[PDB]
Amino acid sequence: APAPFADFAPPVRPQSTLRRAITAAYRRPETECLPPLVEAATQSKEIRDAAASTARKLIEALRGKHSGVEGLVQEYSLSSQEGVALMCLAEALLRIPDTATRDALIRDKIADGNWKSHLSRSLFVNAATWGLVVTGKLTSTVNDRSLAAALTRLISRCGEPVIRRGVDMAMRMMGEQFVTGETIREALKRSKELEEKGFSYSYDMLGEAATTAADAERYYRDYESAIHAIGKASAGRGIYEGPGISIKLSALHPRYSRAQAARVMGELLPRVKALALLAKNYDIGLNIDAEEADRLELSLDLLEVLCLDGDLSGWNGMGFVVQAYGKRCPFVLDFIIDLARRSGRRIMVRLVKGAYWDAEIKRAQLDGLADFPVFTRKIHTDVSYIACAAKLLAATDVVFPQFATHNAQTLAAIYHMAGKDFHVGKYEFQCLHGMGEPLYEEVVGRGKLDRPCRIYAPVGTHETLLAYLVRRLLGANSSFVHRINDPKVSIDELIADPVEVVRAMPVVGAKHDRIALPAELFGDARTNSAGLDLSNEETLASLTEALRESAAMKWTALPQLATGPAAGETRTVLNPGDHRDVVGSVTETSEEDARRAVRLAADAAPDWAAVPPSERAACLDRAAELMQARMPTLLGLIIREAGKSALNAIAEVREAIDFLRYYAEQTRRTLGPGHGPLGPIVCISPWNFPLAIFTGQIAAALVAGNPVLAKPAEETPLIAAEGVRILREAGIPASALQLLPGDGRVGAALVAAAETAGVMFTGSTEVARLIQAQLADRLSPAGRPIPLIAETGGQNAMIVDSSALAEQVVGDVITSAFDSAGQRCSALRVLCLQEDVADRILTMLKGALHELHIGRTDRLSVDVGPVITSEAKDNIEKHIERMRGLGRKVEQIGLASETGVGTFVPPTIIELEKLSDLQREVFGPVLHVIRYRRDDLDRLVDDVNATGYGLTFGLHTRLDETIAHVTSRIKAGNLYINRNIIGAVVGVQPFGGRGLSGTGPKAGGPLYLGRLVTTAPVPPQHSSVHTDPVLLDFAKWLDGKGARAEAEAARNAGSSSALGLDLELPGPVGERNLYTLHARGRILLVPATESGLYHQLAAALATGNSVAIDAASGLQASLKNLPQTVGLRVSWSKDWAADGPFAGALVEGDAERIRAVNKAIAALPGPLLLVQAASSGEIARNPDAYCLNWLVEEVSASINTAAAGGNASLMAIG
Amino acid sequence: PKAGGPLYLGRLVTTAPVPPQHSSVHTDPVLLDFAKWLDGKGARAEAEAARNAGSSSALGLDLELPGPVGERNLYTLHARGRILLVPATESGLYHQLAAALATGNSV
Amino acid sequence: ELMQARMPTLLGLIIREAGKSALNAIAEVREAIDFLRYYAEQTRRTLGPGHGPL
């Protein structure tokens, strides 16, 4: 049995002094990075004046010769949308291979009217890209209805001539500007013209981000075939005069990441070596492009091995990009220069600024890391670039610097820095094809600056070029190429010296004012939890030790009653991934001690309620600090107890920290003396989020002033006991927080205990239904139902149309379905693929599935851990075999023999015929796939809704019409657009569903605490200016009937209702996180009196609901002559079980009537109903007898606004 | 249609053009239910006409028009209300219903 | 353009024929100018050979 964490994340090689200096700079504060760069980039006044003169001369030449799309737009008086629509049409017409067939379709069919009839895939799938081309502005999604209107308008106005011009323009742009050629042979033919003028080329076959082994093999053979063509054409010109190739490591392996470093070195490295050997034979350059910041240091391990590999000796063509926007850049250069010296290889070093800026900002914010790995002010990158050029220019004997930039100021500074002594091979400039030639035609050649420039030349088809053209175009307001074309930007502004500008700032290197550090995402409201960077070798080394130390701890969980730990039946807790690994011991609670704990909680209730809310909140904040400091140890326990990977354990601890800080802040915003606690609250939690949900429920109940009986899932008591220990250390008295480990019997004994005043349950729908039945017997001392929050299972779908990017979909599907072995309530269960793309996506999905590593989770390389128990495994496997027995296609990863010591289920894909093939939630790594025809999208949404669940839901589409349709029709609590459907963030995606998935209110949302007090406070931002019109019609009807007081109460309910609340919640860049209040649906009304009925109806209608009124009330004559608008919302029900599902209930009666009704409601099939009851006298006395908070449904929607490939808002941030 | 607005000229020609900015991403949900019902009946051409009407309808357009500072000038497209349908044939009725429902109307 | 250049004369006629004040006569002529230019622009945005007149 291997020791826990003994092989967690060993580095590829021992970290040298130079490598350690790189890692140390990874997220160094920006104020610390800039001063040495300013110093290194400083040049003499004489040079600075000469550089400014050269830059001005270049810029004057550029502006003096400065259109294709612009001239088309001008000639035909096109609006921007017409221009975009025209280019999309042209793109689609160019997918027709035969020119005569295309021209015939244009002349006969397209021009003469209905283009829609002749052209499964929206014409406008790539309209965000064309929008960038036409307008210079990036939109994340496409207003396809606006584009369709614009296309119809422009064709009907201008006819075939405009279509012809659009087609010819798109053909030129896609075949000659965005790429040098469609194929390497075409690109090579077209390169002769500029090679004869002194340019060189580096060809990019556009491979990137392989998703499957087959993808990686295709990109490999593309590179290999290109090397042959380039080498044949180079014909002995060598690496400086002759052409080369550029590759992306991410194209060559589907798991190119630090977590998979062993596979990278074993499988990716030999592929690079084979390509390098071919480049060596032809004596051409082979450049490794730089990608995301978390791949930089890993790529250095490949560069090191290749440069030390004697089989490659004699060839100086190996090249490597370094990104000056990165804080590690100068230290990377020190490492590379030293590697060049040690190996004797003159490494070609391409200095760039960097292509992933927006994405790096978003990623660091999402991951809660200390700082960014890139600068946040554009001028800092410019200074970094010039400083790094000074370092490179001092080492031209051992490296070949390649200065890639389109910025004339940057170019001029380096041209003068390098000096007058020049020979080919000393250094070169580089630029992008179809972008940099105007500038470099003022550089290359004896009549200019007589410096060479290598053109980075994309090569590929329309489909390949469009994939990441958005990133390449960002054209941002800060970009030189955008500014050169802005008439409002002066040449003096363009030749401004970034070195001297930075030097003169009041704080050198200050972070951008408009970019939040990850810790500050929420500003003054609360401190964001911090994560850990699993790509940082220092973090991995320290985590390895802390994780090993955590496995040497004698973790226990005991019944921690107010009076101290209690005795009970004791058993070991075993690692689900390896039963030989004993994690700890749990002493379970007797049912007698559970009842005693509730009595102790009841006795302690006044003392805890008397702790002021601010001080209760301070305990939560202290617990958050303790959990943050203890995170490494907590990770180790979660990893071993709950089958979680390190990434998922980090997220788990972060969520716990966030719950604590969120409920603390919500308390400070709301709770006062009039919001009395319920009393002892029983918190019952699931195994699968064994710290986060556990902590969230308890923290909320405690901070609302209730003592808590905490019953953690029987599978995961140890982390729960540690959470209770931390809360107690933070100041929660033992009498206010009692831990009661044990199985469902302990939960049931707590629920049934006489003094239990509320129940917070997260777990399966079936168990919640048992608790609902238990509580249907029960009333509070005030004769009212015991509040139950029951957050339950999901049958979560993602719909993908033909506009979605398959690689993006597959990544989000693999994560959503199989992260944590599908043991997230939010996990993707049903992927719905539009028929026209289903086969391609399914092929990619199966290929990605087979790249997952399943095993014991104390290794960073493990993607998917075990299922929690053998019973869970048996239940999941029974489902898989049932499906397999029905003839459904089943794809499963093969499991390693090492899984035999634990309980594992391989990630599984099951292709279904109908969504009705599924019965109940299957809580495991089982993704079901359904296909749908586009016209059946609305029926499909019905089918998803028809399961009765309503937890998470995903939609991948670029089309606004589809987003609007699907999000308006889906009925789920957490929606996700163009991203995964998991990892909801507290206070950002308040989490919780409807129907079989939850009663609400949402955890991590603003209505939660109000359920845990007897009188709900007004949550922050909780109001709506909108009044339900059916409520208004009802109020007028009431006045017409003479029910004047009820009409006034109805109007008051109309105003008090927060139906229609529509907020954007603060969060990371590149995402829009929305929170809205909608109607719940159909509310069951059980009235006793006419006035009670009118009050119930007003409450329900004011919150947008329809109603089913108990026909046994005999109150039919009280609703005579309703306006049609109100009648449409009213039904009468003699058989409540026949007229559901309902989404809540309002009950009027005395205590025994309430109890009887509550029992009947609990017996209704389907969802647990949030019931509110009041007596007739309470209705008369209290305008809030029925609280409107619980008659609306919260919906959270998270939209990935970077999905098009860039962040529009951050294009304005420089 | 309103004078000084974008629908006006289209009333004065025998085939109306698509006015500038005249579209909406919203689809009437009753139209959608009608299309599914047509689908189930095998009324394939009518279901297609219904879906097309749902998409081309500009119901829900909600624009701010350029104007002076210190003023917000909004232009929105709502349902007309209740439309009188005088069909002759079943298919004609289905097409009329599609047009009226797609634009948010009752009939 | 002609109405704009002749607005002072048009105002005089509108003031005396229709009982308008000078400010309201200005608004009247401006609105006529705006209709002319608006329908001109809307035409340039929309009308093609298939939009036959009544």
Ligand SMILES: Cc1cc2nc3c(=O)[nH]c(=O)nc-3n(C[C@H](O)[C@H](O)[C@H](O)COP(=O)(O)OP(=O)(O)OC[C@H]3O[C@@H](n4cnc5c(N)ncnc54)[C@H](O)[C@@H]3O)c2cc1C
């Ligand atoms: C031939 C060639 C090869 C390239 N290869 C690669 C590669 O392998 N990997 C890669 O990542 N990039 C690469 N790039 C660069 C990237 O694609 C952009 O072209 C480059 O960063 C633009 O810089 P510029 O000096 O031409 O323009 P500029 O307008 O001078 O600089 C723009 C750059 O500034 C940076 N920036 C913008 N805003 C901010 C901000 N708020 N804070 C900090 N920095 C900011 C970004 O890096 C941005 O690209 C390459 C570029 C060329 C010309």
Ligand SMILES: NC(=O)c1ccc[n+]([C@@H]2O[C@H](COP(=O)([O-])OP(=O)(O)OC[C@H]3O[C@@H](n4cnc5c(N)ncnc54)[C@H](O)[C@@H]3O)[C@@H](O)[C@H]2O)c1
């Ligand atoms: N909606 C959400 O936010 C959310 C979050 C996480 C998990 N879940 C759901 O939780 C489930 C997985 O967790 P689980 O396997 O631990 O669920 P579960 O229903 O098996 O157990 C949950 C808890 O209820 C207790 N319990 C069992 N029987 C009981 C009874 N008769 N009376 C009182 N308590 C009883 C258990 O001991 C445990 O503490 C999944 O269905 C998942 O979808 C929902």
Ligand SMILES: OCc1ccc2c(c1)OCO2
């Ligand atoms: O557009 C220039 C460019 C070249 C190579 C790249 C890149 C951008 O991003 C990462 O690799």
Ligand SMILES: [Mg+2]
């Ligand atoms: Mg269970």
